[PDB]
Amino acid sequence: GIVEQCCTSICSLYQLENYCN
Amino acid sequence: FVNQHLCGSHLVEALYLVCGERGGFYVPAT
Numbered sequence: 433g434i435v436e437q438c439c440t441s442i443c444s445l446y447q448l449e450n451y452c453n
Numbered sequence: 454f455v456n457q458h459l460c461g462s463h464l465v466e467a468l469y470l471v472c473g474e475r476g477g478f479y480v481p482a483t
Binding site for chain 2: 434435438439440441442443444445448449451452453
């Protein structure tokens with residue numbers, strides 16, 4: 433869940449790429 | 454790119470910079 437991952441917590445390009453796949 | 458809290462259009466921008474520029478995008482046009 434991109435919102436729970438980035439709005440709520442800290443996320444990085446490493447995780448962002450999984451939402452690109 | 455730097456790791457930080459990202460939301461809304463800023464989140465979409467980050468996704469674009471990392472992967473939309475590779476052609477891997479679904480573009481949420483609004």
